[PDB]
């Protein structure tokens, strides 16, 4: 995964630790 500011999807959040909304971590 990535970290903050990393493009992600709440359902399939690809962030290591943080959040995932609007298509971002």
Swiss-Prot record:
This is Omega-conotoxin MVIIA. Omega-conotoxins act at presynaptic membranes, they bind and block voltage-gated calcium channels. This toxin blocks Cav2.2/CACNA1B calcium channels (IC(50)=0.67-208 nM). It acts by neutralizing the outer electronegativity and sterically hindering the ion access path to the entrance of the channel selectivity filter. It also shows antiproliferative effects on different glioma cell lines (M059J, U-138MG and U-251MG). In vivo, is lethal to fish. In vivo, injection into mammals induces adverse effects, such as tremor, diminution of spontaneous locomotor activity and bad coordinated locomotion. It is found in: Secreted. The chain holds residues 46 to 70 of 71 of the full protein. Disulfide bonds join 1-16, 8-20, 15-25. Changing residue 12 to A: In omega-4; 2.11-fold decrease in inhibition of Cav2.2/CACNA1B and decrease in efficacy to kill goldfish (LD(50) is 1.80 mg/kg by intramuscular injection). The lineage of its organism: Eukaryota, Metazoa, Spiralia, Lophotrochozoa, Mollusca. Changing residue 11 to I: In omega-5; 1.8-fold decrease in inhibition of Cav2.2/CACNA1B and decrease in efficacy to kill goldfish (LD(50) is 0.93 mg/kg by intramuscular injection). Belongs to the conotoxin O1 superfamily. Expressed by the venom duct.
């Amino acid at each position: 995964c990535k970290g903050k500011g990393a493009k992600c999807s709440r359902l399939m959040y690809d962030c290591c630790t943080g959040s995932c909304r609007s298509g971002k971590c």
